[PDB]
Every structure is written in structure tokens, then in C-alpha cells.
């Protein structure tokens, strides 16, 4: 009744994103006004 | 209309496989020679091959004379007799027929009301369990 094949391949890309990280050192100011400047 | 043995000559068979296998993956088709009997032993004698454009799933006979130019070339030896049927091949798919097969088979029967088709499957046809 049917002679064709299908050949289900992985022609599609894909991805899994949980790029979870730790540090975040971005920007500590301990001199918000330099604390008497002097 | 039963109990119909189909004897085959061993010279016939192995020619059916060899040309029936050398063309693999693309399928392949030839002819049978033999002779009807009253009802039961529709024997077979010898076979041969029509030229053809073979695919993995489909094929036809290109030339319409190499089967006619050769019988007339055979009777000089008369090593065989007239035509009785035709075979074809499903290389890995199982043994059955298709809507194309019947349309051509439907010609032979009305032409001659006991002609026969033959199906073979050489890939899964191991040194044991043939499936013809």
C-alpha cells in the first residue's frame, strides 16, 4: 500500500537555556560621597 | 480451483535471484516460460529479462521487442517452450502486489486465464527462509 520511507532526522536546531551564574560583582560604591572627602 | 502445485525447475529459480539481486537496491523484472496443464501443475521451465528502467520502488519494460526477438531466436534450439507468466521484485519490502501490478496482471489473465505473477524479496531471503 505504501513504499515510501520517512527518515525522521534532526535537521532542526535546538537549545536549552539555563545559563545560571553566580558572581555578579558589578559595582560597589563604598564612596557614595567620599565620607567627608578628606 | 485449488490444490494447484507450482513446480519450478532449479535452472529457473537461481536465474530469478541473480538478476533479481544484482540490480539491488533498484528493483527488477523479467519473464517466465512454461506450460499450463489441465488445472493443477502450472509448471515453469526457464526465465529471462526484459530491459528496463529500475528504481527502488518502480520499473517498467523499456523495449517491447527483446522478449519477442529472442523467443524467435530460441526456437532454433527450442530449448524451452512458450510464455506462461512474469515476475518482479520487491527488494526489501515484503512479498505482495500493488495497484500497478494488477493493472498489468489484469491484462494477462484476460489474455490467458491462468497466467501467474511471482514475487521475490532477496534482501531478507537468507540461506534458509526464502520468502518467494
Swiss-Prot record, chain B:
Q: Its domain of life?
A: Eukaryota
Residues recorded as binding Zn(2+), renumbered to this chain, are 88, 90, 101
Q: What is this protein called?
A: Ubiquitin carboxyl-terminal hydrolase RPN11
Further information? Present with 16400 molecules/cell in log phase SD medium.
From the record, which residues define motif JAMM motif? Answer: 88-101
Annotated MPN domain ranges read 6-132
Its biological purpose: Component of the lid subcomplex of the 26S proteasome, a multiprotein complex involved in the ATP-dependent degradation of ubiquitinated proteins. RPN11 is the only catalytically active member of the lid and serves as the essential deubiquitinase of the proteasome.
- UniProt gene name: RPN11
Entry text on domains = The JAMM motif is required for the deubiquitination and degradation of ubiquitinated substrates.
Q: How is it modified after translation?
A: N-acetylated by NAT3.
Q: How does it assemble?
A: Component of the lid subcomplex of the 19S proteasome regulatory particle complex (also named PA700 complex). The 26S proteasome consists of a 20S proteasome core and two 19S regulatory subunits. Interacts directly with RPN8 and STS1.
List the cysteine pairs that form cystine: none
The upper taxonomy is: Eukaryota, Fungi, Dikarya, Ascomycota, Saccharomycotina
Question: Per the similarity annotation, which family is this?
Answer: Belongs to the peptidase M67A family.
